[PDB]
Design a protein around this ligand. Structure first.
Ligand SMILES: O=C(O)CCCC[C@@H]1SC[C@@H]2NC(=O)N[C@@H]21
Ligand SMILES: O=C(O)CCCC[C@@H]1SC[C@@H]2NC(=O)N[C@@H]21
Ligand SMILES: O=C(O)CCCC[C@@H]1SC[C@@H]2NC(=O)N[C@@H]21
Ligand SMILES: O=C(O)CCCC[C@@H]1SC[C@@H]2NC(=O)N[C@@H]21
Lengths: 119, 119, 123, 123
């Protein structure tokens, strides 16, 4: 079983810590990004998500509520057991910016990947 | 203030119900999709997310843990007050499939939009 | 129907003109966006793409090489013929911004949708 | 450097060959994917794209018109020259599947990334 509980680093140098996974697959955590729109403002930020409970390589999603920006990032992906029996999260993300008017919604969503491994 | 609490329908005919938003911006809810990979299997499914607390048009994210599939969808977007003072969620989503091997990860992530309004 | 040749408008109010589609489904065109990072700078920009040639509701893609910034957008989608014979392009796009250092690559790609129908009226 | 002309391999083991880039930054090429929805069907497929012409680390896009399915992929990204002069394409893609009814459009677009470097060895 691959599970999300524990400390992770992604390929950008960001680190996150994910707490215990409950009976419904729910979890909370913290995220410290290495990169940002304004790197001088980066603070620790909370995350909340759900993983599938029974699968050995479960898919999951989480939302990061950035404490230094009006932006939100969502991550979704799959917790894999790699060739060496080590856990790897392959994720894709959407980074949503706050726009002042619905008419500028088109500009507001960045997309990307991240690979996480244990710290 | 636009907030997520309440009942919503999206442009595909899906409906969701979002509970009270807590002091940290956290919320839970339910989702009944009108469309699916296998429509004959569609069951009510739970969601969990975070919205920014203080903004009048906050950004948010949520994860839907599908009860009839190993897939997960994440939604992120912004809660807008439209020209008539009505609430509209403009969202983008990533639909993550479960793949059996890390080598097939490339195939696993669909992307799309949804507009939600009150039921 | 669903030859991309012609004039099209999207939901944001951008216009595009696509030329003849050749035997290989290849086409060029021009694009006038209604929105941009720096909207004061907007100028007509060229596109190049390919559609599937024999499909009645073909998928397709094209690239817009913006002439007023260092960005590039690609669109991909499908031309549908609706229950009234009306052509509708449903597209998704990626808008790539130029960054200088590979370590900033993560920041550089936006995603979105557009719906296009043929320009309704002539000048 | 960062003329797209040449042979490239991505992280999935696909290969592509891009021809001369013209004065407008336009190029054609061929693509042999290492992976597919139906991998038994894979055949060489044409591409067409545009890169920014004067930028040293240009952004670009291209469309692949798959010859063995009704799908289309677009790639967009940026050619970087790393601290050793090595060229690296960092791309994101959208892969559009054909559906029959507009009401199924929501299901039809996948998203992903690829990293390309020039083919290292000749046959
Ligand atoms: O700058 C912001 O607007 C908030 C922080 C965003 C950090 C992003 S989330 C996706 C990517 N992966 C990371 O590890 N950090 C960046
Ligand atoms: O079929 C599945 O794999 C699970 C259900 C996915 C339903 C998707 S989520 C994005 C889109 N918006 C909706 O309202 N439903 C579909
Ligand atoms: O801002 C730029 O540098 C180039 C213009 C980008 C315009 C984008 S492309 C996707 C979206 N759809 C449009 O019609 N215009 C915007
Ligand atoms: O499956 C198909 O019908 C067409 C082939 C799709 C291959 C995709 S395109 C994006 C990804 N990168 C590759 O090198 N190949 C896959």
């Amino acid at each position: 079983k691959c599970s999300l509980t524990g400390k992770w680093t992604d390929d950008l140098g960001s680190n996150m810590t994910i707490g215990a996974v409950n009976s419904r697959g729910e979890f909370t955590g913290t995220y410290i990004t290495a990169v940002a729109d304004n790197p001088g403002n980066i603070t620790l930020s909370p995350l909340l998500g759900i993983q599938h409970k029974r699968a050995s390589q479960p898919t999951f999603g989480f939302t990061v509520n950035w404490k230094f920006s009006e932006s939100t990032t969502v991550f979704t992906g799959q917790c894999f057991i790699d060739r060496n029996g080590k856990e790897v999260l392959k994720t894709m993300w959407l980074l949503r910016s706050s726009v002042n008017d619905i008419s500028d919604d088109w500009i507001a969503t960045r997309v990307g990947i991240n690979i996480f491994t244990r710290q």
